Amino acid sequence: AALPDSVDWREKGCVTEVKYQGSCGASWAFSAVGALEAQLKLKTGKLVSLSAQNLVDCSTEKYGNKGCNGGFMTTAFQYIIDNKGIDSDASYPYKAMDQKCQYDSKYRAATCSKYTELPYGREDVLKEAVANKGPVSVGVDARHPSFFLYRSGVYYEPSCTQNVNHGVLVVGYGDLNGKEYWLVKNSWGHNFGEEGYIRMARNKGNHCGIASFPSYPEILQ
Numbered sequence: 001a002a003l004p005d006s007v008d009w010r011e012k013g014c015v016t017e018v019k020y021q022g023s024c025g026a027s028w029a030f031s032a033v034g035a036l037e038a039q040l041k042l043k044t045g046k047l048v049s050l051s052a053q054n055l056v057d058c059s060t061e062k063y064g065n066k067g068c069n070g071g072f073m074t075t076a077f078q079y080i081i082d083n084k085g086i087d088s089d090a091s092y093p094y095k096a097m098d099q100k101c102q103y104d105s106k107y108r109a110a111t112c113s114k115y116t117e118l119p120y121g122r123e124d125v126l127k128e129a130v131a132n133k134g135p136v137s138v139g140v141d142a143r144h145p146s147f148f149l150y151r152s153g154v155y156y157e158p159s160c161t162q163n164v165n166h167g168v169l170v171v172g173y174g175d176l177n178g179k180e181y182w183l184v185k186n187s188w189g190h191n192f193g194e195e196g197y198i199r200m201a202r203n204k205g206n207h208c209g210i211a212s213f214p215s216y217p218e219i220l221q
């Protein structure tokens with residue numbers, strides 16, 4: 001045991017406000033910028049919301065992504081590398097639909113040097129990345145009423161699978177009343193769960209596929 005028993009990156013002012021994706025399946029775009037927003041804060045001291053809409057409109061078919069019909073955080077990061085930047089959310093706000101690409105380099109608020117993917121199903125490796133690097137973009141299996149209806153406590157769904165279909169951000173981990181959890185930031189607004197967060201069962205056999213496809217970006221000096 002060489003890691004903290006608990007982490008929460010919100011407490012270092014590294015997490016932006018919970019967003020609301022609505023009826024556009026842009027959880028992957030929110031997951032991606034969430035993670036890159038923390039690296040930018042660590043780097044620059046400034047906490048700035050980055051443009052998930054930029055990803056939806058611009059990180060498209062060349063990156064295997066389909067906008068509001070889904071995509072991946074790893075290739076969202078590759079776009080941001082290839083494009084040599086991403087706009088701030090305030091210059092390029094979220095509309096919850098597919099649009100023409102309107103990136104403007106004058107409004108670039110972050111960059112990406114590289115990203116790292118973690119091995120599938122490894123909750124000890126995920127825990128290390130979150131303690132030592134920052135918030136980690138993950139997929140979860142969110143296709144269950146109990147997920148949609150989640151209010152509080154440590155989520156555990158018996159019929160949850162490791163096949164992921166929903167992009168979220170791991171911003172911490174800990175133990176609440178006997179139950180180890182990952183602290184997860186969703187993009188369903190503030191009225192979902194614990195002011196927009198869900199604590200999901202940890203060290204429970206890759207529960208809901210939380211450790212199936214982690215990745216995190218880096219901004220180097």
Ligand SMILES: O=C(CO)N1CCc2c(c(-c3ccc(Cl)c(C#Cc4ccc(Cl)cc4)c3)nn2CCCN2CCOCC2)C1
Pocket residue numbers: 025026027028031063064068069070071072073075138139140162163164165166167168212213
């Ligand atoms: O789960 C498995 C196998 O166990 N999956 C099959 C294999 C897989 C899944 C996810 C993955 C990771 C994270 C997220 Cl977030 C998602 C998603 C999503 C999503 C879908 C629809 C909408 Cl509307 C929104 C989000 C998928 N990543 N991968 C790895 C494949 C990555 N690649 C290879 C390179 O080009 C892009 C696709 C899913």
